[PDB]
Amino acid sequence: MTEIALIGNPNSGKTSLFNLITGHNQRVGNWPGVTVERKSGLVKKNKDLEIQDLPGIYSMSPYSPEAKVARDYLLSQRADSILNVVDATNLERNLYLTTQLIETGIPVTIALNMIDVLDGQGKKINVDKLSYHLGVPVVATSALKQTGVDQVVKKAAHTTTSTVGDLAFPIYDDRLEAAISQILEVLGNSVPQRSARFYAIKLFEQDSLVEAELDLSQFQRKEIEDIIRITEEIFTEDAESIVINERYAFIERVCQMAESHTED
Ligand SMILES: CNc1ccccc1C(=O)O[C@H]1[C@@H](O)[C@H](n2cnc3c(=O)[nH]c(N)nc32)O[C@@H]1COP(=O)(O)OP(=O)(O)NP(=O)(O)O
Ligand SMILES: [Cl-]
Ligand SMILES: [Mg+2]
Secondary structure, eight states: OEEEEEEOOTTSSHHHHHHHHHOOOOOOOSSSOOOOSOEEEEOTTOTTEEEEEOOOOSOSSOSSHHHHHHHHHHHTTOOSEEEEEEEGGGHHHHHHHHHHHHHTOSOEEEEEEOHHHHHHTTOOOOHHHHHHHHTSOEEEOBTTTTBSHHHHHHHHHHSOTTTOOSOOOOOOOHHHHHHHHHHHHHHGGGSOSTTHHHHHHHHHTTOHHHHHHSOOOHHHHHHHHHHHHHHHHHHTSOHHHHHHHHHHHHHHHHHHHHSOOSOO
């Protein structure tokens, strides 16, 4: 059946949503790191959908074994849809992960959760603008007030690897895009086609996990090493910082659009 993965920072309301969606009473708690293993369940309002609760994760270069369970689930290619649960009150921080999720090529739908806390803070987010600039569907949800939950599941079900055509990725500085294209050429079929961009950017960043997982030839490694060196000279910066700063810069732009109330 259709597999929907709940992915997002710890303490963002993933399990709270899962409980509402499935009828389960899985562990929910007011600190990061409550869920520690995968839990499956059927969506109650549509039994053709299976949803997976997973440990929280801050980055796809993860900081804990628990987060690595979420990462490895996604890179195993089992999910048809990512339901990215985003804490609306800490948007910028949460979108760091989001950018990497979009790059996997598994279609992303955002549950913009804890919208009730944002409402209580006297703040708002332009959901249509956020969606437009991020290139993914966005539904405002509250697991507390039980709003938007059935809507975001329906959207996630409709936003699948089988229904979505050409996927729209976050576009960075064209000097980085050039290096990404070069790395993709070198990789060829050495990575799954759907997630190739994710892996190419991780190779540029010289991510240890990804370098260990991919069985790249000496030839490929030498050409990638050369592409990174050339690009660092162009940027006048190290590779790791180039990518971090480009993600940050992208998120900054999108968030100033999400804060924008003025009609356009
Ligand atoms: C009134 N409720 C709260 C308001 C603010 C902060 C905590 C709570 C709190 O008493 O506790 C729970 C929630 O009640 C609350 N919570 C979840 N959704 C919402 C929401 O929409 N709104 C509010 N106010 N709280 C929410 O957020 C907390 C995390 O939920 P979790 O489901 O455990 O999150 P993960 O599964 O992502 N975590 P991990 O990755 O490590 O498994
Ligand atoms: Cl992490
Ligand atoms: Mg949880």
